[PDB]
């Protein structure tokens, strides 16, 4: 089958600056009419892929001037002349010369923005969850940049290792930030045995690590 090789696999561009993505075909994609059997799709977070370029260089309906497809035969380039926050997503090249239709690995475009320290919030287990027999402590790290963040959990000064799970949202299409949720899992018995639940957050935007805590039964 026709192998599609995308380069780079990820890049970070500050809005207003250009972005370029290379696509290499293992077979000639050149057509009799002078066009190429090469397309570009973008997949924004939480959405289906969407057409950008077809026939090598033709813009899909609704796709602005700032996006261009170029190259011929085997070597292709997708250019974004001026990057915007909304362009955050994964870009894919695809061949439609023959079946199977094949795609490149995908290129993840990160929108570079100013360092934003997260807003940190802590949520004790709800009385209703405790009533059901379980306990989940939730630490929210809201709207931060870059994505690298560290969350440390402590229960009465004991560092928790292996009993929490994190989930990071994809880059926000508007303000270019990420959000993270760390969940501490404990049995109801262990939850009721301790007082201080502390979430310690490390991030580039914080001069020192930030601790958000609560005491069970208030104090």
């Amino acid at each position: 089958d026709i192998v599609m090789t995308q380069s780079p696999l990820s890049l970070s561009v500050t809005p207003g600056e250009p972005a370029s993505i290379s696509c290499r075909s293992s077979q000639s994609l050149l057509r009799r009419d002078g066009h190429n059997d090469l397309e570009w799709y973008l997949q924004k977070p939480g959405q289906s892929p969407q057409p950008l370029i077809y026939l090598g260089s033709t813009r899909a309906s609704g796709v602005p001037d700032r996006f261009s497809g170029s190259g011929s035969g085997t070597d292709f380039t997708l250019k974004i002349i001026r990057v915007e926050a909304e362009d955050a997503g994964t870009y894919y090249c695809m061949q439609n010369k023959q079946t199977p239709l094949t795609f490149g690995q995908g290129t993840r475009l990160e929108i570079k923005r100013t360092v934003a320290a997260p807003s940190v919030f802590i949520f004790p287990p709800s009385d209703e969850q405790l009533k059901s027999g379980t306990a989940s402590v939730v630490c929210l790290l809201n709207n931060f940049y870059p994505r690298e963040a560290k969350v440390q959990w402590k229960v009465d000064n004991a560092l928790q290792s292996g009993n929490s799970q994190e989930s990071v949202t994809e880059q926000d299409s508007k303000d270019s930030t990420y959000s993270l949720s760390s969940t501490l899992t404990l049995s109801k018995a262990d939850y009721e045995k301790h007082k201080v639940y502390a979430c310690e957050v490390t991030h580039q935007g914080l001069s020192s690590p930030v601790t958000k805590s609560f005491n069970r039964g208030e104090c």
């Binding site: 807003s119 949520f123 989930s167 949720s181």
Partner: protein, 219 residues
């Protein structure tokens, strides 16, 4: 113009599923209908296609999906179908219907998730993440809903029946050690609104017919 996708869902290994791609506003017999799948956090993989009537309703399939696929069209229903037999865990993915024609050209459907697992469906427990002093930083409060212990994916979470979108972060689900997923959905809102403005999270887990409207109250 709309593409309605259905027929996905939980299926046991070695089982069968029939995906539907219902077209509205245009005739499918004049278009080429493709199927593309994407495993969670992965790239794109073409599965097969059925050409238009003028192209002898010719079908092609991916080598990976060898002799297990049957793509067809019910021109009376204006629907395309992808019948998949003898499924394996490696077939777990979001399946997209792609139109190649005059209308909805190189455009994708919202997709339908196929889960090939031995695990049984479980509806979630919905617990509030109540706003309080520990979730109030500055003049901003955070609140949410903990959507716990469900299988399979997906769960949809909205706030105030779609009227609350600004400040919302529905986190990707994590698979817990139990084999059950869990997610949090949060909102940051003004702290001055906490006593007067009502905040309801609308959770729907269609695999288990679980639909819950949860009111998240402060204190």
């Amino acid at each position: 113009v709309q593409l309605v996708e259905s027929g996905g869902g939980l299926v046991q290994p070695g089982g069968s599923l029939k995906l539907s791609c219902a077209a509205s506003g245009f005739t499918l017999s004049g278009s080429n209908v493709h199927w593309v799948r994407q495993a969670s956090g992965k790239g794109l993989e073409w599965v097969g296609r059925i050409k238009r009537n003028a192209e002898s309703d010719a079908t092609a399939y991916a080598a990976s999906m060898r002799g297990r696929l049957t793509i067809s069209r019910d021109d009376s229903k204006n629907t395309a179908f992808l019948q998949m037999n003898s499924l394996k865990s490696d077939d777990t993915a979001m399946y997209y219907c792609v139109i190649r024609g005059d209308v909805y050209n190189r455009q994708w459907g919202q997709g339908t998730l196929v889960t090939v697992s031995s695990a049984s469906t479980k509806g979630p427990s919905v617990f509030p993440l109540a706003p309080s002093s520990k979730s109030t930083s500055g003049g901003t409060a955070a609140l949410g809903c903990l959507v716990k212990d469900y299988f399979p994916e997906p769960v949809t979470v909205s706030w105030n029946s779609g009227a609350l979108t600004s400040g919302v972060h529905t986190f990707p689900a994590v698979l817990q050690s139990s084999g059950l997923y869990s997610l949090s959905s949060v909102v940051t809102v003004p702290s001055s609104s906490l006593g007067t403005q009502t905040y309801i999270c609308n959770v729907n887990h269609k695999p288990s017919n679980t639909k819950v409207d949860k009111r998240v109250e402060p204190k």
